Design a protein around this nucleic acid. Structure first.
Lengths: 209, 97
RNA sequence: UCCGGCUCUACCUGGCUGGAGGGCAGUGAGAAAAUGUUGUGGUUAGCGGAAAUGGCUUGGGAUGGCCUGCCGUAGACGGUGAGAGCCCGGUACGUGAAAACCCGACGUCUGUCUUGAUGGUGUUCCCGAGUAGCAGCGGGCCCGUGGAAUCUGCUGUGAAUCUGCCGGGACCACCCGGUAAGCCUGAAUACUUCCCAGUGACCGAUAGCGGAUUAGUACCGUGAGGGAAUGGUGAAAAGUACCCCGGGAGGGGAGUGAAAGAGUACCUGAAACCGUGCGCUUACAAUCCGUCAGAGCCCUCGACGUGUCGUGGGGUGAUGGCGUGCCU
RNA sequence: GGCGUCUGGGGGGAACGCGGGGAAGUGAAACAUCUCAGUACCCGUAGGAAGAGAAAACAAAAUGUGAUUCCGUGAGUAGUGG
């Protein structure tokens, strides 16, 4: 059981969250986390690579000269692989790279990852990043300076709280996310993780039932 | 293009960094302008040819429009909604240049 | 709902033919044309748009390094004389349409039910005809003629209307479901000649579309039809003014340029291949062309001493022995 | 049939569709039935999508379903087959 203190931009604390024990005391399985991130990246990767084999190229559909009497070798098309202009043989093709990793392996990855960060005290919470309804990236940057010094960081802000997203978007390191599409690559690439409290509550009362 | 013939400019990059100059012609289709006193080249012309020292074109992103107050300043665009013009305007003062 | 006249006819009723308030619906598949308002509704041009001539050094040029500041609903991208958030173009964001076009929105305009319906009750009539069905040849249905239904094509024959008819894998009786042979019907679905905007663990000039270069061109063929090759100066042409040799090409000086080991045959500039010099060796010798020993000469590093061996190293290498190319 | 007038159609298209026609090399270690494939190709007509489409249907005594089409499964199964 790990406790977190919410934090405010104006220089105060509101309250404390008492995180679960089973989500955030999982022991990581490095092979599991490896497999899953590899799958994510593979499904990201698009298969725009195609080549024209011997049967799609232009021409070649006439035996260019005799079989015998000539002196030279035997040839059946002017577009075969050994020519210069000829067909690719076993080329790239447009294909899919997704692979079907299961729900339990995925979630085990995510819980183990959040545990790896929590044990090392890199999960910070916060009510908000901003004052009312006017984005200003200088605010959020100063607040993250208060709360953090590392290069890179993750931010979990919901959908409705658009101002925090619009604010912190432009920063160099930051990589913002909604907790409905919470994943593993984006967690592990970071060093610190900033949850909103609404986000934590949603995550927890969505998983726990 | 934020430069027109007749304007005055300050050179940024080149050996002639720190030069005032008057624009003579522009070449907007390729963003280059022939400023006076800068980019001096010893062209050979044979006739009765001769080694003659002529201008050559800056690229327009190596000159800042000199402010009306005599300092290198950016330029921007208000509207005089009555007359419907879009005046080129410095971003230190706001004046007409 | 009121009446106008009509039920051949004046009179009581039942039933029509008109108009009227009304309702319903409408460019619907269910009838069809145009109308005028009309929405910051959309498309067809675009526009503004934050913040460093910052300091030292390098360098031809700073967009580099180091040190100082700033913007950020904008650190996507590209270019600019070398990796540029603060130079430029533009992005986040907000703006913008006289006219035409598309969406609905309306009011016109058009019909349309309104003269009406809910139920009762015992029997005649109708319920899509050369068709359904059966036989003969055939197609396709998981089904290749098999016991082979259903769906069907050509010929030949050819029925009834509700105790009717067709199906429930031959067929028959019972039960079940359904009511053919008249017609329309959106949405989910498939596709990209063209157009617009982007992405890439795709190529990067023998690759990638055949086509980065005049490319379906040149060239070939009578003809259908085949079907190629060639990208890069440099930051900007400042593309060598002038002189000398030469008929001219081409070159040497002088110059430009950061560099002409960048000269319009030009980034770099391999090998094969073609030659010029320097050292060794080779014209009494039988050589898969090398390898092991090695004389002699030439170069070099080092300890020393008037030149000299060495835990040396490298090029050639007289002469001797051994030795029958590579792959399938 | 002839004469006059009025409105239509006529051809091109990259794929996609529906109706019709319609092979062969291949596999079967030969081969004709079969398969390749009702594919390629050819024809006639379209549309922005098409065609099908309102039960003379399924089902099994369960008191069931309720136009059609396209996707997943049933299923490489029940079966068919020199």
């Amino acid at each position: 059981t790990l406790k977190v203190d919410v934090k405010t931009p104006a220089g105060k604390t509101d309250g404390s969250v008492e995180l679960p024990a089973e989500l955030f005391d999982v022991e990581p399985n490095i092979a599991l986390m490896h497999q899953v991130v590899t799958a994510q990246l593979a499904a990201k990767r698009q298969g725009t690579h195609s080549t024209k084999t011997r049967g799609e190229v232009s021409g070649g559909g006439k035996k260019p000269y005799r079989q015998k009497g000539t002196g030279r070798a035997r040839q059946g098309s002017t577009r075969a692989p050994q020519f210069t202009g000829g067909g690719t043989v076993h080329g790239p093709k447009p294909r899919d790279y997704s692979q079907r990793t299961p729900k339990k392996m995925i979630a085990a990855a995510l819980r183990g990852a959040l545990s790896d960060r929590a044990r090392n005290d890199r999960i910070h919470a916060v009510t908000e990043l901003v004052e009312g309804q006017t984005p200003s990236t200088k605010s959020a940057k100063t607040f993250l300076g208060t709360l953090t010094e590392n290069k890179k960081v993750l931010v979990v802000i919901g959908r409705t709280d658009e101002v925090g997203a619009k604010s912190v978007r432009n920063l160099p390191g930051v990589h913002v996310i909604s907790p409905d599409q919470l994943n593993t690559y984006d967690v592990l690439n970071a060093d610190d993780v900033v949850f909103s409290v609404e986000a934590l509550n949603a995550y927890i009362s969505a998983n726990s039932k | 293009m934020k430069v027109h013939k007749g304007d005055t400019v300050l050179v940024i990059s080149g050996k002639d960094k720190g030069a005032k100059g008057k624009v003579l012609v522009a070449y907007p289709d390729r963003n280059k302008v022939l400023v006076e006193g800068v980019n001096r080249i010893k062209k050979h012309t044979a006739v009765s040819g001769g080694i003659v020292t002529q201008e050559a074109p800056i690229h327009v992103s190596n000159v800042m429009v000199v402010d009306s107050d005599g300092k290198p300043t950016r330029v921007g665009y208000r509207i005089d909604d009555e007359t419907g013009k879009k005046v080129r305007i410095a971003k230190t003062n706001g004046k007409d240049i």
